[PDB]
Scaffold this active site. Structure first.
Site, short mmCIF file in Angstrom:
data_model
loop_
_atom_site.label_atom_id
_atom_site.label_comp_id
_atom_site.label_asym_id
_atom_site.label_seq_id
_atom_site.Cartn_x
_atom_site.Cartn_y
_atom_site.Cartn_z
N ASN A 68 -6.90 -3.03 -7.13
CA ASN A 68 -7.07 -4.47 -7.27
C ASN A 68 -6.60 -4.84 -8.65
O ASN A 68 -7.15 -4.35 -9.64
CB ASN A 68 -8.54 -4.83 -7.09
CG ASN A 68 -9.14 -4.19 -5.87
OD1 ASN A 68 -8.77 -4.53 -4.74
ND2 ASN A 68 -10.02 -3.21 -6.08
N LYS A 116 -2.71 2.05 9.25
CA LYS A 116 -2.99 1.01 8.27
C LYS A 116 -1.73 0.18 7.99
O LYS A 116 -0.63 0.72 7.89
CB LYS A 116 -3.50 1.64 6.96
CG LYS A 116 -4.79 2.45 7.10
CD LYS A 116 -5.15 3.21 5.82
CE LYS A 116 -5.72 2.30 4.73
NZ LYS A 116 -6.29 3.05 3.55
N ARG A 157 -6.67 -7.32 -10.81
CA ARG A 157 -7.44 -8.55 -11.05
C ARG A 157 -8.87 -8.17 -11.39
O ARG A 157 -9.26 -7.03 -11.16
CB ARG A 157 -7.47 -9.45 -9.80
CG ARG A 157 -8.10 -8.79 -8.55
CD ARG A 157 -8.49 -9.80 -7.47
NE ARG A 157 -9.49 -9.27 -6.50
CZ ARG A 157 -9.19 -8.55 -5.42
NH1 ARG A 157 -7.94 -8.21 -5.16
NH2 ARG A 157 -10.14 -8.13 -4.61
N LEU A 201 -11.32 9.51 7.07
CA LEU A 201 -12.53 10.09 6.49
C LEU A 201 -13.73 9.54 7.23
O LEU A 201 -13.91 8.33 7.32
CB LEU A 201 -12.62 9.78 4.99
CG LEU A 201 -11.40 10.20 4.16
CD1 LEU A 201 -11.67 9.97 2.68
CD2 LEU A 201 -11.03 11.66 4.40
N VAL A 261 -15.40 -9.44 -8.14
CA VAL A 261 -16.74 -9.98 -8.00
C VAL A 261 -17.76 -9.17 -8.79
O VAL A 261 -18.52 -9.71 -9.59
CB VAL A 261 -17.15 -10.01 -6.50
CG1 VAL A 261 -18.62 -10.30 -6.34
CG2 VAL A 261 -16.34 -11.04 -5.73
N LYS A 314 0.80 -1.22 0.00
CA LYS A 314 0.00 0.00 0.00
C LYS A 314 0.83 1.28 0.00
O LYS A 314 0.47 2.25 -0.67
CB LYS A 314 -1.01 -0.01 1.15
CG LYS A 314 -2.33 -0.78 0.84
CD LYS A 314 -2.13 -2.05 -0.03
CE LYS A 314 -3.43 -2.54 -0.64
NZ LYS A 314 -3.23 -3.73 -1.55
N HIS A 361 -16.75 -4.41 6.13
CA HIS A 361 -15.94 -4.17 4.93
C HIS A 361 -16.18 -5.15 3.78
O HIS A 361 -15.46 -5.12 2.78
CB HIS A 361 -14.45 -4.11 5.30
CG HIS A 361 -14.17 -3.17 6.43
ND1 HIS A 361 -14.00 -1.82 6.24
CD2 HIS A 361 -14.07 -3.38 7.76
CE1 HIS A 361 -13.79 -1.24 7.41
NE2 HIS A 361 -13.82 -2.17 8.35
C1 LIG Z 1 -14.60 2.74 8.87
C2 LIG Z 1 -13.15 2.41 8.65
C3 LIG Z 1 -12.48 1.54 9.67
C4 LIG Z 1 -12.44 2.85 7.59
C5 LIG Z 1 -12.94 3.74 6.46
N1 LIG Z 1 -11.78 4.54 6.09
C6 LIG Z 1 -11.67 5.83 6.49
N2 LIG Z 1 -10.59 6.59 6.21
C7 LIG Z 1 -9.52 6.12 5.50
N3 LIG Z 1 -8.45 6.87 5.22
C8 LIG Z 1 -9.57 4.71 5.04
N4 LIG Z 1 -8.79 3.85 4.35
C9 LIG Z 1 -9.45 2.67 4.27
N5 LIG Z 1 -10.66 2.74 4.91
C10 LIG Z 1 -10.77 3.98 5.40
CL LIG Z 2 -13.26 -9.12 -5.57
#
Ligand SMILES: CC(C)=CCn1cnc(N)c2ncnc1-2
Ligand SMILES: [Cl-]
Length: 446
Positions: free
Chosen positions: A290, A159, A292, A204, A295, A116, A236
């Site tokens: 992604n 992350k 690939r 966000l 779905v 990432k 998710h």
């Molecule tokens: C609701 C949650 C745990 C994440 C939602 N979310 C919020 N801000 C970011 N910068 C993100 N990157 C992946 N997912 C994100």
């Molecule tokens: Cl997928």
């Protein structure tokens, strides 16, 4: 065109790929576990090879067994579908090293976008808008980490670089939680990916999930095929997807699409791929790519006329894209409801034998599934057993057709989410459109 390919997958996507192959006159080799001898696509395939016992580690993740199947049948290429080994760079590398075509990008590209931190740097360089963040991995200096948090501005999110898809992240709203949040995210990444690298992004609060479909060939052409909204989620996991995304104007679509296509050119991308964004206050922010097919590809097919699996196969054979950007037009609207064999109260997989089955039909109704009356859903694999996709000349017609098709769908003998999908189609906020990534969980709470 490719003479013969191994379909290195199962269930609905294996069937999807088999049909595309048959349309192109490509011979099919269905590799399968001992639990999957009676899969619809296995029964329809030209040749079959049992690659191992039921557990995925000994079958659908069994790299040597899959390459051996390709060797023994004289196959020339391997389609990994989605999940399993489709984002495994080591697998792609071994496939091409062994002399077979991997139906996907170059292994180097899989690796680049599977990290990432490295993926974000590349997107930022190419001009794709990203989430404000650390632009680099965090170290162990908490003075430095507090400074990065201050510069970004709380709330932030920690992350894992080796993670993705909502896996391995923690929201931090103040200094008091930063150290422990970084430490725990790091520990969980090390345990799950043997990669303890983490980064920081702006958190966000109420974004939508909007993703852009691309195709790129070996002749230098790269196009975007509009977008999909996938905000309806539980933990998710996408539950409903639609295309185009409500409230996205042609100007915004053009703005973001061109940046994605340009990014493909910059990175030397090949095949189908998806750029995932968070969309909030009219602004896009890249989170991951992604590398690939996904779905939810069928919603994009319905609104563009482009067969994305057939394109993947054409590209792998060294054919240019069948369509130019100027020929890509968004027409109508499509919605996809994932059908899951799951318990309505626990949401755990609910495997078992289907005793009666009936698929919906009619104008604009597309049913993507391997299931049939008397088929046993095995316990060893994903809960998703089919996808119902409905198209209309507008979003309201698409939703109306989905409601009717959901009512015709009969799957007895196992528990499914059909009733839940009916609830979602009848939800007044969904019918208005533009609900965010938190909505379904909010609704299910009520
Ligand atoms: C609701 C949650 C745990 C994440 C939602 N979310 C919020 N801000 C970011 N910068 C993100 N990157 C992946 N997912 C994100
Ligand atoms: Cl997928």
């Amino acid at each position: 065109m490719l003479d013969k390919i191994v379909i290195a997958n199962r269930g609905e996507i294996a069937l999807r790929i088999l049909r595309a192959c048959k349309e192109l006159g490509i011979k099919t080799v269905a590799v399968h576990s001992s639990a999957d001898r009676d899969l619809k696509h296995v029964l329809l395939a030209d040749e079959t090879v049992c690659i191992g016992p039921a557990p995925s580690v000994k079958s659908y993740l069994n790299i040597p067994a899959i390459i051996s199947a390709a060797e023994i049948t004289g196959a020339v290429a391997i389609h990994p579908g989605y999940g399993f080994l489709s984002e495994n760079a080591n697998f792609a590398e071994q496939v091409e090293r062994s002399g077979f075509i991997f139906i996907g990008p170059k292994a180097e590209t899989i690796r680049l976008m599977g990290d990432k931190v490295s993926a974000i740097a590349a997107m930022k360089k190419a001009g794709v808008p990203c989430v404000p963040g650390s632009d680099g991995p965090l170290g162990d200096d908490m003075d430095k980490n507090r400074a990065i948090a201050k510069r970004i501005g709380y709330p932030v999110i920690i992350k894992a670089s080796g993670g993705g898809g909502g896996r391995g992240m923690r929201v931090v709203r103040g200094d008091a939680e930063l150290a422990q949040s970084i430490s725990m995210t790091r520990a969980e990444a090390k345990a799950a990916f043997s990669n303890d690298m983490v980064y920081m992004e702006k958190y966000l609060e109420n974004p939508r999930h909007v993703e852009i479909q691309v195709l790129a060939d070996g002749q230098g052409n790269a196009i975007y095929l509009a977008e999909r909204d996938c905000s309806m989620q539980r933990r998710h996991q996408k539950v409903v997807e639609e295309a185009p995304a409500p409230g996205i104007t042609p100007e915004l679509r053009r703005y973001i699409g061109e940046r994605c296509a340009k990014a493909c050119v910059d990175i030397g991308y090949r095949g189908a791929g998806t750029f995932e964004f968070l969309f909030e206050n009219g602004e896009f922010y890249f989170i991951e790519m992604n590398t690939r097919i996904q779905v939810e590809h069928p919603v994009t097919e319905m609104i563009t006329g482009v067969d994305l699996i057939k394109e993947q196969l054409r590209i792998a054979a060294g054919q240019p894209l069948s369509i130019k950007q100027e020929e890509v037009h968004v027409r109508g609207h499509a919605v996809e409801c994932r059908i899951n064999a799951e318990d309505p109260n626990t949401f755990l997989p609910s495997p078992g034998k289907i005793t009666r089955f009936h698929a919906p039909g009619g104008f604009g109704v597309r049913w993507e599934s391997h299931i049939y009356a008397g088929y046993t859903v095995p316990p060893y694999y994903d809960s998703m057993i089919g996808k119902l996709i409905c198209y209309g000349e507008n979003r309201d017609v698409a939703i109306a057709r989905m409601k009717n098709a959901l009512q015709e769908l009969i799957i007895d003998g196992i528990k499914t989410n059909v009733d839940l999908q009916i609830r979602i189609m009848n939800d007044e906020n969904f019918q208005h459109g533009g609900t965010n990534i938190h909505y379904l969980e909010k609704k299910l709470g009520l």
